[PDB]
Amino acid sequence: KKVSITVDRDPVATSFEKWAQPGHFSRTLAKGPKTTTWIWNLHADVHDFDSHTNSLEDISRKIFSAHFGQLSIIFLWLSGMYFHGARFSNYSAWLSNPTAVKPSAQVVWPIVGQEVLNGDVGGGFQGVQVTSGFFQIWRSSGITSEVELYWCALAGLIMSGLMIFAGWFHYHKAAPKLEWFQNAESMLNHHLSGLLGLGCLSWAGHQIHVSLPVNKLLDAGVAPQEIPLPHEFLVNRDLMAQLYPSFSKGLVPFFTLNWSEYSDFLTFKGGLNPVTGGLWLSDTAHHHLALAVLFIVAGHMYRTNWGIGHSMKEILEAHKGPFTGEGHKGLYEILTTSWHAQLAINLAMLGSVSIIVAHHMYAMPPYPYIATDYPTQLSIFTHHMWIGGFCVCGGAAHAGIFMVRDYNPAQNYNNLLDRVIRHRDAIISHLNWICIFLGFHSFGLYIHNDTMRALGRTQDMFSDTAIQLKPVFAQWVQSIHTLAPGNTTPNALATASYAFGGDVVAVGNKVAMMPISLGTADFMVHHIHAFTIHVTVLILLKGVLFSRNSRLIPDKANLGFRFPCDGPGRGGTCQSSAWDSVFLGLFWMYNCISVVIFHFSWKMQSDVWGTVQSDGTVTHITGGNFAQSAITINGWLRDFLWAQASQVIQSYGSALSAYGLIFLGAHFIWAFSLMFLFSGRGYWQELIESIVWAHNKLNVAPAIQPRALSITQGRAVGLAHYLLGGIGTTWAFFLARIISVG
Amino acid sequence: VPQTVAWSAKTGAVMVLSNILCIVAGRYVIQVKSGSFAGFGLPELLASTSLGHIVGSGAILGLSYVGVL
Amino acid sequence: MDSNFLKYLSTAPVLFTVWLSFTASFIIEANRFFPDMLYFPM
Amino acid sequence: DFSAAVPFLKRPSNLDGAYIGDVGFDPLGFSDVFDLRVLREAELKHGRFAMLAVLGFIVQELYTFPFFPKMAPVDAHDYFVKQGGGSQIIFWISFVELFGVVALFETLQGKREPGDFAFDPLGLAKDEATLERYRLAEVKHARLAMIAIGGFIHQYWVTKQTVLEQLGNF
Amino acid sequence: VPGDAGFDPLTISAWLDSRWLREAEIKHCRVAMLAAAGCIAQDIFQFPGAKMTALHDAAVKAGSMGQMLFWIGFVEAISTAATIQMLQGGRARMELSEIKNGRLAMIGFSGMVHHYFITGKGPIELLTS
């Protein structure tokens, strides 16, 4: 039983004394401010626990309790989302008419004329239209009343209180020892089996006993207050067997392995529900039940306390071949002694999963009536692309913090890390060449087209009409997925998504999903994507690989992860740190994700979204202009940015005037950021000197001597306002555009 | 839909076979622990029969799928 | 009341957040009871 | 040692007969986590509210003031929400509770017993012995009235009959 | 240590606390004692205004089982404090009699309930016929 619970009791005293002493956590900051730099250095380094403490135990304790604090905030956030749905929303009116009522769960106070924001969202209601997709979640959950939304809100508040108690309790009363945190086999067994496996299984149970009966009655057309309460399905097994006759047999088919009996509610239909335009919830129930089984199975792989299981160290040390030296030896020690190495992996994977979520949810719309709510489809795609891109760049941020700090060459001799660092010139030169090739052969095709169209030579352009760059591999994969039902997925009845080909699914005369054809414009913008992702990898990988040393600076690890430069010598070493590649790679992430959401927005409006009428033909939002106009930059400028900015500019005096104001406000913040990005600290300190002089003249100089921001903080402030401004402009542009027309 | 059959002694036979198959396999391949009377305990027995109900359930469903039953 | 908790509430960010929330709050209230004051009424 | 009340439960250890009414009943171990002075202040405050409430019921069926309409105590809650006297009572309770907040700070700072407001106008407490018995009786009544309160309000909901009329009928 | 016939063939005692095992066994003993005696008692006589397995669901609609659940749940909460404080740190004949009759009650109750599945009848009702 070497996997055991070990706790120090009453480690840290619950006292308000350190609250009154800002900066108590570091030796530099605890002696108080003398310049204004102290104030900024206080906020900058506060959650950098491994910069304050030497011991991995105290660092692990601070992290565990801070994760409870984060959970408490998320539960509070969720509880408020339910309460605004319960109290300030048109949810009940939306349940009766999901295709007519626009979801709204935010009402403004009348103060300075701002009550114009309470627009007519429908259902005898005035409020701010919400695009987070909660209404579609709640109907998928089977909520059907505001009373149940109040109970969910209380359930979030109780959980929110319990997490903040646990964070206090596990830091101040019962803090686990380092040997508790260093149980990677136990944690993985429980997080696969217990968290993910029982998470899916329990949710499958809710889906089967609550979501499936309630949503069958809704899609049959029964009024929400005419629907039995969710526990009457749990007790009256006769009533549940009316909707799904397999329930007449109970749990004998489950235990005797006669699973085919359960095909009423555990289907493999594929495609969409014609009534709601969403995934069949009988499929999602089977999906979560099947996922639950193999998460519970996966969580029995590793060895804890009984000899059965794998040692993760043994798996890693055995995988070594003739190209890779000692192989994965020493990686277990890295990943059970470095939190940053763990955070680097988990941020890159969570960011990747968030990017996948964006693609899977628009193409295979999971919730009822979310596919034809186009403001939600655009909002949750754009939101989850940004979460993914940010989290991916923090994976390289913390891979750099690992390499600078937690990397020890003595324990990493001739293994995979040692070998990567020892040919990093070959990696970075090959990536650099790919990015030049990719930029020339993706963006240069656009420049070729701008010139040819401007020169009157439309026969010389790369277009469907002219020279054709077809995406044959993507078209071929689309062919296979339409052929899969009955052929390579024989028991499936419909395709995984109608985006691959097949029918047009219409709900309330609006397209839910329909085949997303790929042409020359799709070939061009996909290689635009591969170029922007590869350059982002190039900037971030070069920062991780050269974080400790270069040919330029032989001792970059002694300067740290985050330093501004090593002087104007060697020609100039401005922005040479690993932090400065995260800084430069967040711009190229911003560039990458901006083109992705622009590609998504224009393609869905031009080729997918719109209205169906007689003869079954579809009138799209921008009328199919993507194919012949997304091949030039002038087409993107004119037919996408200029044409679709009309709604946000003409929004003044409407309920969308808030988006019009945020459009201008974010344009401001973006431009203001360039003051911090294009300027240097030395100018601003000398300007402050004259301002200090005028204060000295009036005897009003401060005792905390004002300083210009650090070189790094000028970069961090410039990047933050650039991101706030750039993303905030697109947020207003996307939301005012798609609320008006979709 | 893949045909499955109500529990019969044939279903039992496959399950029994699979459980025993894994009990013998577990005596051979479990690396950390009288062919079955050395070092055999409950976590070894509870693991081999857990894989038997995984292998047996898969075998039963597959043999029902193809017609062997 | 605890003197270390009162010394915490006397810290610059709390007082800045409280004072400017109080300041913002009586501008908001003044514009509720007396709205649309483009000029000093005279 | 073992708990006086629950023989098979161990004594909590923050409940060592310091307070009057201590029978060692604390299974959830809220006294291992939270300050027992705060908990005792709440115990006596909840109990005093409950005692005034149970009497509040009983007298309100027997008599009501001529200027106020005759009606059941839960109906009185809703009537005085909309009439204005409920906010009156809420304001004056909240006013007293301000000096109660000061009182609880005095208790936390060590200078006051948790429910002691020095409220002995009629001099009923004579010396140490009678005061210990009186406060034991107060704690026992306070806990009992908290139980009682749940019964009158919940029973009125389930069967729409008042406490005295429910004893009178059935 | 009570009721030790040297009968642990599967050796559960090696991989779970003997205190936890004894507590669970004696709880199962006493619950099954009440259940088996109650199962025979219903066929012997009936409480006014009030068969084996379906009567569970005939009783839940009134709220009887829910109320009993609430009070068992309360007692089991103080009893989970009991087992945690047990675990974190002329009469022996009577303990052995309790544990023996309780194991017998587990066998007996299992018999009566599966007899209900066989015949839709209670224990002594079937015995009579």
Ligand code: CLA
């Ligand atoms: C967590 C997410 C979240 C978010 C973003 C919102 C957002 C909003 N809510 Mg909702 N709400 C939430 C959770 C949330 N709520 C929860 C969990 C509940 C249940 C209790 C509610 C219950 C609720 C009600 C009942 C109402 C709102 C209302 C509102 C709106 C105005 C709030 C306002 O100005 O009050 C401002 C109130 C103040 C007292 C101002 C306080 C400002 C101080 C100075 C902030 C300082 C914080 C402090 C310094 C932190 C440090 C502590 C210190 C010790 C140093 C706004 C849209 C209102 C609305 O929609 O009206 C139409 C409304 O009436 N909310």
Ligand code: CLA
């Ligand atoms: C089955 C066991 C189990 C489960 C469910 C979890 C669950 C979790 N752990 Mg893990 N953990 C476990 C065992 C388990 N742990 C063990 C054995 C160890 C020791 C090796 C650890 C060590 C560990 C560390 C070091 C950390 C976690 C963290 C987390 C949280 C991850 C963030 C998240 O997704 O939360 C959100 C998802 C949720 C579902 C929220 C649920 C909140 C409760 C706690 C879940 C369980 C409730 C209960 C069992 C369900 C009752 C069901 C009932 C109604 C029928 C999550 C609550 C991290 C964290 O955030 O710390 C707080 C973290 O830093 N765990």
Ligand code: CLA
């Ligand atoms: C699970 C996620 C996670 C976690 C736990 C951490 C944790 C950490 N990171 Mg990492 N990081 C993450 C994600 C994460 N990061 C992501 C997604 C990125 C990409 C942007 C980075 C990029 C990154 C860098 C580049 C650096 C860190 C650093 C740090 C450490 C110091 C934190 C601190 O003191 O900041 C204190 C927190 C603040 C000062 C907050 C201010 C930040 C912004 C500007 C405010 C937020 C704006 C807001 C959302 C919008 C405002 C609305 C507007 C309209 C008003 C800590 C170890 C630093 C370090 O040295 O580590 C050793 C460091 O240099 N991280």
Ligand code: CLA
């Ligand atoms: C429109 C603005 C713009 C442009 C064109 C570039 C261009 C480039 N950047 Mg820069 N960058 C920009 C803004 C821009 N950046 C900003 C704002 C930042 C701030 C954070 C950065 C930060 C940055 C970093 C950190 C990195 C780059 C990299 C790159 C290169 C990518 C490789 C490539 O595509 O090669 C192909 C070249 C192009 C697409 C340029 C346009 C050429 C077109 C096809 C026309 C060519 C016409 C032809 C030459 C005419 C010849 C005749 C004429 C002379 C008369 C390329 C040189 C990366 C790099 O150098 O690695 C390879 C890299 O690591 N950039």
Ligand SMILES: CC1=C(C#C/C(C)=C/C=C/C(C)=C/C=C/C=C(C)/C=C/C=C(\C)C#CC2=C(C)C[C@@H](O)CC2(C)C)C(C)(C)C[C@H](O)C1
């Ligand atoms: C302290 C102080 C002073 C004072 C004072 C004051 C105001 C003192 C007032 C004290 C009061 C009001 C005590 C009341 C306690 C009530 C209890 C314990 C509840 C019993 C109910 C039960 C058991 C029940 C029940 C039942 C249920 C639930 C429902 C029914 O269907 C059935 C049933 C009826 C059986 C003064 C000013 C004198 C001065 C002095 O110097 C200091």
Ligand SMILES: CC1=C(C#C/C(C)=C/C=C/C(C)=C/C=C/C=C(C)/C=C/C=C(C)/C=C/C2=C(C)CCCC2(C)C)C(C)(C)C[C@H](O)C1
């Ligand atoms: C919401 C609202 C209203 C209201 C209201 C109110 C105030 C409703 C009242 C709620 C209360 C006080 C519920 C508490 C009940 C006490 C319980 C359950 C204790 C049971 C003892 C147990 C389980 C065991 C005891 C034990 C046993 C075994 C024996 C040994 C001792 C012990 C261990 C203690 C209004 C009227 C204002 C109207 C308004 O429009 C809306």
Ligand SMILES: CC1=C(C/C=C(\C)CCC[C@H](C)CCC[C@H](C)CCCC(C)C)C(=O)c2ccccc2C1=O
């Ligand atoms: C303007 C500017 C300054 C001057 C700006 C300073 C000294 C900071 C002024 C900030 C004031 C003092 C407080 C900020 C309050 C803001 C109104 C709100 C900010 C939001 C959060 C900080 C709360 C630099 O120091 C600098 C340094 C390096 C590169 C570029 C620049 C640069 O561009």
